[PDB]
Amino acid sequence: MEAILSKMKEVVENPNAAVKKYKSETGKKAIGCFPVYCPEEIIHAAGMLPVGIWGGQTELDLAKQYFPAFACSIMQSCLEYGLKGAYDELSGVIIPGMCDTLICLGQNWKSAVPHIKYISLVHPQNRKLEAGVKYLISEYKGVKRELEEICGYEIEEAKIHESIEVYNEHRKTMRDFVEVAYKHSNTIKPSIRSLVIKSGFFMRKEEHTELVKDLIAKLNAMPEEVCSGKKVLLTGILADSKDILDILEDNNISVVADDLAQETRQFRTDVPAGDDALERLARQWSNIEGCSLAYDPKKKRGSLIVDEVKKKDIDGVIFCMMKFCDPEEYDYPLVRKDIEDSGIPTLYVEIDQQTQNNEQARTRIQTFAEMMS
Amino acid sequence: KEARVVINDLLAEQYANAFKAKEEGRPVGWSTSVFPQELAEVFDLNVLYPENQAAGVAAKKGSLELCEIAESKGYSIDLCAYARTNFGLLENGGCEALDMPAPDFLLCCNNICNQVIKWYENISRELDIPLIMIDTTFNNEDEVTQSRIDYIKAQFEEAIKQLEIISGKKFDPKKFEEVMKISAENGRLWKYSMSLPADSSPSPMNGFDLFTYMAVIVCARGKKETTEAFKLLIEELEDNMKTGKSSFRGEEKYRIMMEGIPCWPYIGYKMKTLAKFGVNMTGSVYPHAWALQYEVNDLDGMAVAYSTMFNNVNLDRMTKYRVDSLVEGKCDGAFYHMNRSCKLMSLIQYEMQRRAAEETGLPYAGFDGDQADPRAFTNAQFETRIQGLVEVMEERKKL
Ligand code: SF4
Numbered sequence: 194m195e196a197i198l199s200k201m202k203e204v205v206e207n208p209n210a211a212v213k214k215y216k217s218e219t220g221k222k223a224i225g226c227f228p229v230y231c232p233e234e235i236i237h238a239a240g241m242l243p244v245g246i247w248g249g250q251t252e253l254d255l256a257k258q259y260f261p262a263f264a265c266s267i268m269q270s271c272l273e274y275g276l277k278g279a280y281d282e283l284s285g286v287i288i289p290g291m292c293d294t295l296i297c298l299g300q301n302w303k304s305a306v307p308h309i310k311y312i313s314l315v316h317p318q319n320r321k322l323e324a325g326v327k328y329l330i331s332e333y334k335g336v337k338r339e340l341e342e343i344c345g346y347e348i349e350e351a352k353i354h355e356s357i358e359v360y361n362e363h364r365k366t367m368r369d370f371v372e373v374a375y376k377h378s379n380t381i382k383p384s385i386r387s388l389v390i391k392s393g394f395f396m397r398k399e400e401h402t403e404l405v406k407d408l409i410a411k412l413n414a415m416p417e418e419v420c421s422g423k424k425v426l427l428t429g430i431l432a433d434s435k436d437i438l439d440i441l442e443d444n445n446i447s448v449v450a451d452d453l454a455q456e457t458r459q460f461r462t463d464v465p466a467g468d469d470a471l472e473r474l475a476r477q478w479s480n481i482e483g484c485s486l487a488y489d490p491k492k493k494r495g496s497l498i499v500d501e502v503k504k505k506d507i508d509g510v511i512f513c514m515m516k517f518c519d520p521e522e523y524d525y526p527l528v529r530k531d532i533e534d535s536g537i538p539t540l541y542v543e544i545d546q547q548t549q550n551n552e553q554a555r556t557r558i559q560t561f562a563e564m565m566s
Numbered sequence: 567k568e569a570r571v572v573i574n575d576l577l578a579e580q581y582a583n584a585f586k587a588k589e590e591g592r593p594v595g596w597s598t599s600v601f602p603q604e605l606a607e608v609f610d611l612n613v614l615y616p617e618n619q620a621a622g623v624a625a626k627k628g629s630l631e632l633c634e635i636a637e638s639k640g641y642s643i644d645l646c647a648y649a650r651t652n653f654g655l656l657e658n659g660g661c662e663a664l665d666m667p668a669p670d671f672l673l674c675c676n677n678i679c680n681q682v683i684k685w686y687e688n689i690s691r692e693l694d695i696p697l698i699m700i701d702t703t704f705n706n707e708d709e710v711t712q713s714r715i716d717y718i719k720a721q722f723e724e725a726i727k728q729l730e731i732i733s734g735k736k737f738d739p740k741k742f743e744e745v746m747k748i749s750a751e752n753g754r755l756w757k758y759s760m761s762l763p764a765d766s767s768p769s770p771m772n773g774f775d776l777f778t779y780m781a782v783i784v785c786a787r788g789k790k791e792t793t794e795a796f797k798l799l800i801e802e803l804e805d806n807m808k809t810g811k812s813s814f815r816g817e818e819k820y821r822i823m824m825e826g827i828p829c830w831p832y833i834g835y836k837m838k839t840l841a842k843f844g845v846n847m848t849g850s851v852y853p854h855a856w857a858l859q860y861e862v863n864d865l866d867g868m869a870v871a872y873s874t875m876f877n878n879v880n881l882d883r884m885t886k887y888r889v890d891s892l893v894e895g896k897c898d899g900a901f902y903h904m905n906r907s908c909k910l911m912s913l914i915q916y917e918m919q920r921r922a923a924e925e926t927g928l929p930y931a932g933f934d935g936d937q938a939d940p941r942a943f944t945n946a947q948f949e950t951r952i953q954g955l956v957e958v959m960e961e962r963k964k965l
């Protein structure tokens with residue numbers, strides 16, 4: 194494992210190094226993808242590197258010129274990084290207007306970081322209407338047009354189809370990983386699970402697929418394991434901070450499934466088949482379910498979480514609530530009730546990328562494990 | 567026949583009629599404040615407005631109790647206070663100060679903001695009622711893309727389909743054209759009447775008055791009764807302009823633009839404080855919000871009108887709105903409400919006010935608040951903030 198884990202550790206801890214390495218070896222550019230969903234397949238088809246942007250543990254200073262204190266933590270970090278020039282090796286960024294805060298960030302970005310092209314994209318709420326699909330195809334054609342202005346050459350239809358196949362292969366592999374991690378929950382600690390998944394954001398997907406298929410082979414060689422502690426499912430925007438993952442392990446907790454925007458939300462829904470490449474991508478958005486950013490008057494998110502809990506005999510669900518995330522805040526009461534109505538206990542923990550003190554999560558998770566008996 | 571009286575009666579009639587429909591088994595809707603009201607008016611449906619009701623209860627100091635009920639259910643205090651008041655209302659089975667019946671269907675348009683999407687998702691799920699969605703995607707380009715126009719028109723068609731089922735009636739193109747003609751004239755009367763302060767020194771009304779009349783254009787934009795109400799208001803305003811009268815009290819020493827909706831739980835105090843310094847709001851962007859102009863039977867133009875409401879256009883255009891309101895308003899300063907509920911307006915306020923100040927050369931100041939949550943506003947701070955703006959504006963008057 195160590196050869197693989199260490200490789201993934203090097204790209205996650207030195208993202209910028211990985212980017213400068215990619216541009217020099219291929220002579221191609223890199224494009225940043227803000228949360229939650231971007232059509233990475235289009236960037237990949239051009240032979241460029243889609244790099245995931247998910248903020249980071251940073252204090253605020255420069256960002257105070259554009260945002261007041263009550264913008265969500267993750268977008269505060271992204272803006273601060275942009276202003277400090279941490280993203281300057283990118284030839285552009287897609288900032289989808291999935292919420293009020295993402296929309297505002299994009300508008301500020303045009304002034305705050307004028308040297309990095311901002312590519313606009315707004316997914317349709319009415320994503321199951323045929324009209325919604327046709328609209329999203331037009332948005333994707335716009336994204337294609339902008340990327341072609343940046344790289345300097347046309348992006349061929351046949352290439353986008355190839356990229357789509359590459360990505361569906363990756364999604365399948367990641368789902369395979371989830372199952373084998375669940376069957377070896379003692380070896381794959383929470384910090385390990387997160388590393389395997391998050392690593393996909395800083396390298397070509399086909400290259401990450403081979404690394405994970407190598408890890409799956411090695412784990413399957415080992416015998417299945419009986420979890421020695423309690424199992425949980427994590428749900429929210431993200432939970433990748435070193436501190437939070439250390440607390441879980443210290444209380445004998447293993448993560449064996451998630452509904453996190455940064456993790457399983459990315460690969461639980463495949464891109465459908467079809468003759469038209471941009472149409473294929475657009476219909477993927479029709480098919481997303483159980484996400485706070487994906488329109489659904491029936492709010493199936495809670496029921497879907499319950500299903501996963503029962504499939505794997507999970508002992509509890511922890512809401513990893515991003516500080517000041519209004520979409521997740523609207524969801525919380527109804528999703529919590531759906532889960533608790535099925536006899537599954539839940540916990541609320543705040544995720545703040547600007548903190549140097551996670552004692553609340555430490556004592557809450559401590560009490561939650563003891564409550565688990 | 568007094569305008570303020572006709573207007574108050576009209577507003578109360580909308581609530582009364584909705585309660586009567588409820589009793590008789592006819593469906594009642596709840597709608598966002600800049601939804602394409604024309605569509606439901608074709609079916610003679612009764613539609614109410616959660617934002618209007620929350621502002622009303624807040625002005626009667628009843629919003630805090632409802633917000634606290636919502637927060638006890640697990641809704642974070644970070645969420646818009648209109649949404650929290652409304653969730654409290656549903657949980658409480660209504661309220662005392664300004665009651666309204668629960669909805670049988672929902673009408674949601676995100677041109678004002680995206681929070682209404684999640685807000686209405688929750689109501690739909692918890693009450694098990696149909697949700698009609700008109701998604702006006704944010705305009706980064708200066709103009710509305712053809713793709714946006716086509717998608718909005720397709721959503722007009724889906725809305726009509728669902729409304730036929732809800733109402734048990736068939737869409738009537740003849741009544742539809744009649745509705746478009748009434749709505750167009752009412753939009754014109756709103757923009758005209760509320761723009762009178764701009765080219766009138768002093769202004770014929772206290773600026774805060776605009777937010778009372780706003781309730782009318784929001785909840786009855788397609789009604790002929792609204793036409794007559796605004797014509798009467800116009801007669802009174804023009805009469806003032808000719809006799810140098812106004813509902814504003816004292817000498818109009820300074821003219822300003824206020825950015826944002828008032829803090830309703832403190833509206834009386836804010837009015838007294840500005841007037842004490844001789845300050846009046848004579849420049850505003852809100853006359854443009856409900857103008858909503860389009861030719862009869864032109865669905866393309868109607869889509870463009872709802873898409874380009876000023877909360878849904880790029881930051882360049884948003885800024886131009888404030889700059890033009892200050893200049894055309896003959897203003898001496900700008901005063902900014904950092905509204906804790908409204909993230910869309912708050913998260914671009916810093917850059918927007920810098921640009922507006924650079925272009926107009928006018929001074930500005932601001933204060934913290936909320937349109938419905940009394941915990942977010944501090945009287946003493948509002949007072950010193952406007953006092954500071956006044957000192958700057960007074961020094962600049964000297965030649
Ligand atoms: S979805 Fe939530 S966390 Fe993400 S940008 Fe919007 S408010 Fe922030």
Ligand code: SF4
Pocket residue numbers: 617646647648649678679680681682907908909910937
């Ligand atoms: S106040 Fe702002 S956030 Fe609240 S509903 Fe109105 S527009 Fe949306």
Ligand SMILES: [S]
Pocket residue numbers: 228229267430
């Ligand atoms: S996000």
